[PDB]
């Protein structure tokens, strides 16, 4: 089993992740990420944008099954985070998602 929270923390600590819908979309447009993670309650059209561009640039996208409050909280942030890009998984096996 993969523990999402453990892997997100491991990737955040030892790799590089970029946070936010707008950056995630931009990374998707550019092919500059290995994985894109979106929250279950991300605005559907934000979710569509990401999927559309990530399919075009060949980036895998994963839906975290929790909300964007929890995603931001997992990341140590006092606000919601509805998506994020894994640019470098670091030591994690997060790209298995």
Numbering used by the authors: 0 to 96
Please quote the paper that reports this structure.
One strategy is to optimize charge-charge interactions on the protein surface. The electrostatic contribution of an ionizable group to the Gibbs free energy of unfolding can be estimated from the differences between the pKa values in the folded and unfolded states of a protein. charge at 298 K and 333 K were similar, suggesting that the electrostatic contribution of the charged residues to the protein stability is insensitive to temperature changes.
Structural analysis revealed that Arg-8, Arg-21, Arg-42, Arg-54, and Arg-76 are involved in crystal contacts. To reduce the crystallizability of the L30e protein, we created a quintuple variant, 5R→K, by substituting these five arginine residues with lysine. We chose these lysine substitutions because they conserve the surface charges of the L30e protein and because lysines are less likely to form crystal contacts than arginines. Guanidine-induced and thermal denaturation experiments showed that the 5R→K variant has essentially the same Gibbs free energy of unfolding (ΔGu) and melting temperature (Tm) as the wild-type protein. The titration curves for E50 and E62 clearly display biphasic transitions. To determine the pKa values of E50 and E62, we used the method of global fitting of titration events (GloFTE) developed by Nielsen and co-workers, which allows an estimate of the titration profiles for individual titratable residues.
